[model samples]
Target: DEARRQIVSNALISEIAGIVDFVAEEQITVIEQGIEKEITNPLYEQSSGIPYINRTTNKDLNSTMSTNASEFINWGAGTSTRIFFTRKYCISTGTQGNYEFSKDYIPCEEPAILSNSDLKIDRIDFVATDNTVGSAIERVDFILTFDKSNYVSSLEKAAEQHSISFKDIYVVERNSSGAAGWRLTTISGKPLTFSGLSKNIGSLDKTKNYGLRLSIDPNLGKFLRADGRVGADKLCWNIDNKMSGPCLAADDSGNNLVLTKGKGAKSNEPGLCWDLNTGTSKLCLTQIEGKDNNDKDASLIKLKDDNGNPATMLANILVEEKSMTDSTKKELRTIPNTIYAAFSNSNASDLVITNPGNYIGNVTSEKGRIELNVQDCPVSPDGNKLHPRLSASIASIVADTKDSNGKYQADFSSLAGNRNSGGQLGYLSGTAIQVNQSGSKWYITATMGVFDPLTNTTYVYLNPKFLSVNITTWCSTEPQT
Candidate 1:
């Protein structure tokens, strides 16, 4: 038969020339890995365990699936339901033991009901094995390569943008999926002012050259700052103005990626930068350690109203020495440094404690060494600034609890109104009975006192100025994936 149809059309032209050399080596390394490694997004798996958002309080609820987001099918608002399966790819055939399994189908989700009379493939079966240098003859193949154009309307627009439903967007088998694990190998040409696929600071640890080359989502512990767009960017540190700094960049081959600043480290300018023209924006800057040392020492207070006193005062206290554990000599501290302050002089001098246990250190480790979790506070005196005197005492306790709720709903609606007014109000000074700071506002009182009723809570102590120090350095050309 013409040499058996020219040896089955030259083994189907060597398997279509190995799929045209694997799609021309993945289109030349996806154009040398640019566009965040060629904008990819395909991780479909959510069988409850809560990772299916459709807002409006869990519309048609059912929760479970949540390793806290790496794109947990966030299809906001109504009709929500999910279930995904399918993903199996194997390739290993460089001789010596072989393998080649495939299953990543994504055509119109599902439609391959073959069964053409048990697919006898129009008859063509031959076999004769002998092994050990003997007889060998096995040839039974029937290949059909359809132009693959199944898009049940982009799989119903990616199953309604992943909130999946149209009755379980059925197909058939495709078990697992993957995508968010931050991986972008080689994207040369860089410099749009550096803030993507980071790492090239080579050598320089003036303490820990504040870093910024993130794309994190380790379950939304979020990263990707200087705003190259992630979920919660936060990981900044490029401060200057003598407050030390780093995070400079350049690419297009002239190569550059400096990131230096230690010893009194201070690069973080929560004034959050990296706007190479409104580039990235996903911030959350949360790294609170040793919990607020007295609100970062009253946020290193920097009082100055001019017309009142010290014409122009300033304050700043920075503490940086994050590692020195020759085995627990402990020193991993950060920010909030103000034992007493004053920069542009004032009467308060460098007064850390004009009184209050006259503390300096070691009065039993400075009785709970002050530290409070206040990442940002400043509203004025500059942009994105914080701690404007504790943001004017939290805007005066949110303007005295706006609408003081009918005096806080008459001091707790009920607790036995002064418990039956006991003995016409026991203990009447010298039995003279005559005291009532005007009634109608009763019942938050309980007295069998030996000292305890001074509960009205109001304390404002500011120690402002500025001391921004943020150091972040992580290494991994490849490891820990």
Candidate 2:
């Protein structure tokens, strides 16, 4: 009866003690006195004073919890949403591991969801376990401790950013409301640079030297380049000239990431990609191979230019060596012009014969090759030569043509006409009438000879396109010669 009555009376004044004023409540309870009892199963003893922020604890309030980042429901910071559940918690005593056979309700710490009584998520959670039936407990704990070090949510550096540290944190992301694969991210939860939790580079608190020390040239700029901020703000690099930023920024629809490059100098200045900065844009070609003619001759990269009189940084060529077995057989690409066959220096009246088979030699000239497909001619109207002769001359000679297929033993004498009449006129440009007796196997400047009564002239034809070569001897003793 005494324990029950004392418990009821103390609970009555416990509400008054949960106030901001220490004076008003202490005056009421002391002057108008009543005996009371306190909770002993927990540390709710008034010996430590009635709690405002804490109820009972043997565990440290700042203790680091197990990491399950993907496991927690992210309540999306800023002005998006705030989360809370029903104001109830589970309590159990050690009884054959059975919580169904458990104990009574305990007073919650009033300063936190009982934060001045029934507040809407007055603060974020420390931890809440499932201590329930069915399966393992899951929590939505966003445990963070305030009053940490200088590393807070700064929009500057990552080497000093604050983060939670755990022991062998094993996390799993879910699909179909179940864990799909292995854990995510680095263990101990790597710190985010500046504000965001991105594990990017530069002033990185990484490698074996995440030593958390001060001096000794700790991070960046030793063998590596010093990196800093961008976005038209402060240029981050503190060294020579590289005021570079990260290419981590993205496009509007998240397609292209931002990248920056230097426009190289024209003839004198230096750059990553060469820029003549004047005419057409130039390309960058790397000399991939060492200039050594080693065993890697045909197997490596070779670069060349194929434009201009001597090249002007416009055209570029990369040559793959020809064969596998040859090393000295690398290819060289070149530009083209009329230098070897200098038609500009050539004479205007220069005929086609000066090109190919001039009487000089078998070696060619700078004028290149000449050509003509002239047919051969015979010596006279005899020997089935198909050669034509004037009626006054050939009528005094042997038999002439016969039928369509020549070389027949028929008299063509009846077919002849006088020079003023229609005579046989069947000689080509190469018809070699016997002009002289130097005729072992020779011909003169080949010409067509026949009788033409139409114009009444001793007819001859000279078409140079079909003219025969002058490699044969001529008969200067003939009549018209």
Candidate 3:
């Protein structure tokens, strides 16, 4: 009993803030307690020429700050009562993703307010919903007065910012029956008219004795105080807090919005805000992964900078080398295995000099498939080849080698019997000297049985086209058959 009593008392002290003045003594009332504070803040005085009427009395104002921030969202750990008059407005959202409520009602500045007497509301309560069962809701109430004389112009400009093309659309209207004063309004359902008989206000204060009670769908309780002005309610997205309207669908005029936490949301949300504008195309995708050099809660986010770029990016892996072989080549040299094709002349192509050669290197081989080294660089230490060292081989290797007629074809052996041992094999006397199979470029298989002077033990450098994209082929030289 003592522990249970302690739990209830502690919950009241820690969770629920405001006093339930009318709790029946022996009823064992279940109150989800939190830190209680008065909403009628002492900081900003209503009489200090503050514009809107601050209704929070020095008495009726009370609120509770949550223990676990996400508890309000995940656990639905918030205060709600089935009783009609018992309601609470919690600060549900913040710019940086937290719950922060303002003590006094803050209105937009003159330029943003745009009108002298418009009922511009600037406060919002945070809400956390996950399905219908355990979701939390906050109701941020504001003052709505009919200053028909001052705010009429800004009222009309409301839908203008949204580029709404509705003809004869007005942002404000006078109550013809002398019942309501100049009311800030919107036409939501079925598009009714103002014909001087009834004014179509988006949301009206139902507490008024004879005013229409706005039927709010509890599920979509993203309530707006824009009767009408932009507000803090929209800011919880850590994005544009601009006020929109009494919207039927969230897509109406003054309501083309990007969400902070609801469906179809984007980062730096409310794609409508100027600060949120970014990029050429909307295919923007970013990630926030936690660092785990050891991969340990590599699952759980870290303390500082909990997120980062993705782990499996195309730029992360290294591309291996592919070896190209030729039957008529000997000694080490770089061979072209990948032939890049320019989509059109406009497509980009670049040459990367892996070696200071400053010359396009070529692969050499012995006639009759004696021995060949496709990776030989005459200027380098091992006379071996180096990587393309260019902007990815993908960007290079463009255009096929062609013949005298501008048609692509490989140079054929036509070795002409200029065979030499430990020397340059049959030479064509110019850069045009190349190992070609048939008239069109094809592959060759070199067979050699000498000790590889480069690696010492001679081995067949097969067509590694399937192995890597960066390899070169080689072979040994003896007398041609």
Off by over 4 Å in 2: 1-80, 83-336, 340-481
Local distance difference test scores for all models = 0.22, 0.24, 0.25
lDDT of 1 by residue, 254-314 (tens): 5543333332445332221222344443232222123264555221222222222222224
* Deviation from truth (RMSD, Å), model 3: 22.6
**lDDT score for residue 21 of model 2:** 18
Q: If both were scored by TM-score, which would come out higher, candidate 1 or candidate 3?
A: 3
- Model 2: per-residue Cα lDDT over 1-481, one tens digit each: 4443333323322322221112111212111122322222111123321111121110222233223322232222231111111012222332221112111222333223222221111112212233222111122122221111122212012222211111111111211211112122233564222222333434333322121101111111212234532122112322246333222345678556533322221232111234567776444432232435665543222223323122235443222345345555433222211111101111113222333223333212322222112223333322222211111122222211122332222222222321222222333222432222222221222223433343453433321212222222211112223
TM-score of 3: 0.22
Q: Report the number of clashing residue pairs per model.
A: 35, 4, 43
| Candidate 1 error regions (>4 Å) | 1-162, 167-329, 332-481
Candidate 3: deviation at residue 286, Å? 11
- State every prediction's TM-score relative to the real structure: 0.14, 0.17, 0.22
